Amino acid sequence: GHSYEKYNNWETIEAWTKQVTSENPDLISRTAIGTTFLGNNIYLLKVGKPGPNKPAIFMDCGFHAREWISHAFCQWFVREAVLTYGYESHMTEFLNKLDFYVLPVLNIDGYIYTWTKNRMWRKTRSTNAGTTCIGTDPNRNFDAGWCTTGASTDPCDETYCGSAAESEKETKALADFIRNNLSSIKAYLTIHSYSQMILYPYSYDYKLPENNAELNNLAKAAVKELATLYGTKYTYGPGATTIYPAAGGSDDWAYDQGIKYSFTFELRDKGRYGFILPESQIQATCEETMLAIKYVTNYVLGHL
Ligand SMILES: CC(C)[C@H](NC(=O)CCc1ccccc1)P(=O)(O)C[C@@H](CCCCCN)C(=O)O
Ligand SMILES: [Zn+2]
Numbered sequence: 001g002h003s004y005e006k007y008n009n010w011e012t013i014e015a016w017t018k019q020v021t022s023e024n025p026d027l028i029s030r031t032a033i034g035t036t037f038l039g040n041n042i043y044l045l046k047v048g049k050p051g052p053n054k055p056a057i058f059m060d061c062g063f064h065a066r067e068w069i070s071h072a073f074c075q076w077f078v079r080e081a082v083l084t085y086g087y088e089s090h091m092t093e094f095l096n097k098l099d100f101y102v103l104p105v106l107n108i109d110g111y112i113y114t115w116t117k118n119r120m121w122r123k124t125r126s127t128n129a130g131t132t133c134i135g136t137d138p139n140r141n142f143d144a145g146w147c148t149t150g151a152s153t154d155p156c157d158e159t160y161c162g163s164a165a166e167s168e169k170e171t172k173a174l175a176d177f178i179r180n181n182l183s184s185i186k187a188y189l190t191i192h193s194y195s196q197m198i199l200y201p202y203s204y205d206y207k208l209p210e211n212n213a214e215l216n217n218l219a220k221a222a223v224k225e226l227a228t229l230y231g232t233k234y235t236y237g238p239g240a241t242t243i244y245p246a247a248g249g250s251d252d253w254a255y256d257q258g259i260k261y262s263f264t265f266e267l268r269d270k271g272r273y274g275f276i277l278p279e280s281q282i283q284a285t286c287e288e289t290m291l292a293i294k295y296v297t298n299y300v301l302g303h304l
């Protein structure tokens, strides 16, 4: 039984992708962009009313298995799109004019493992040469200063960069999807938790993107917007100096592909519950995050 106000296991979320697609055929279509290490389908939802030459925003959740509020958020975004389409002017305009690719869970194998065996697992569940230690950090696995700072070379470490950039089936599938759809994807959003932040490039070195001032202003206004609802305080800025250096990130990789609006979100909280954010915070967290995401979406729409 799926609920947007609880954490849903992978079987539930997978059935939800199919059902939400069936119930909303004018607004949603579903594809699989690849399969995981363990062979699970990586589903992707395309949310938007059909039309010609539509720009797109790409958003993924569930890079990191233990970050359950991330997975819940991508589901909430879809909830909002279908519920409010037609009644709320902004969401209606967004869906009419842009497509949203929502990838509800990238690291499906890790997610299953947090439900069955280890709530605090972060990495993929693939094997490594020369050791019994499992998995790669998918957010150290992209070809963006790959494996150079803030990433480990030890397969037993939580930030292990992998055997090569895109060595993981899941990160290969996401990078392939983005490469194949580069001319339409105008923004890349990647949802994580916790620590309450809106980050933009760069994390792989202490350097700033060409459109630094624009991304800084946008991130500042989006955090201001998020706080309107419950007063939740976010920080923002370039990854390396705002959270820590961390090479091989998907936001930096996406940005270096030419996608000018590339953000990583770090949802609630600031450490009281950390990864184990209680289900009773799902609603408030997703609602205030919707305000930031809609703010970014509206800006992208207005600055094509
Ligand atoms: C708690 C958050 C910050 C997660 N970080 C961790 O789980 C690493 C371990 C940790 C660090 C800080 C507090 C608690 C745990 P995260 O969401 O996974 C942070 C992201 C930040 C990457 C750099 C910015 C975007 N390129 C990551 O480490 O991949
Ligand atoms: Zn994360």
Ligand SMILES: [Zn+2]
Pocket (backbone or CB within 6 Å): 080, 287
């Ligand atoms: Zn709402």
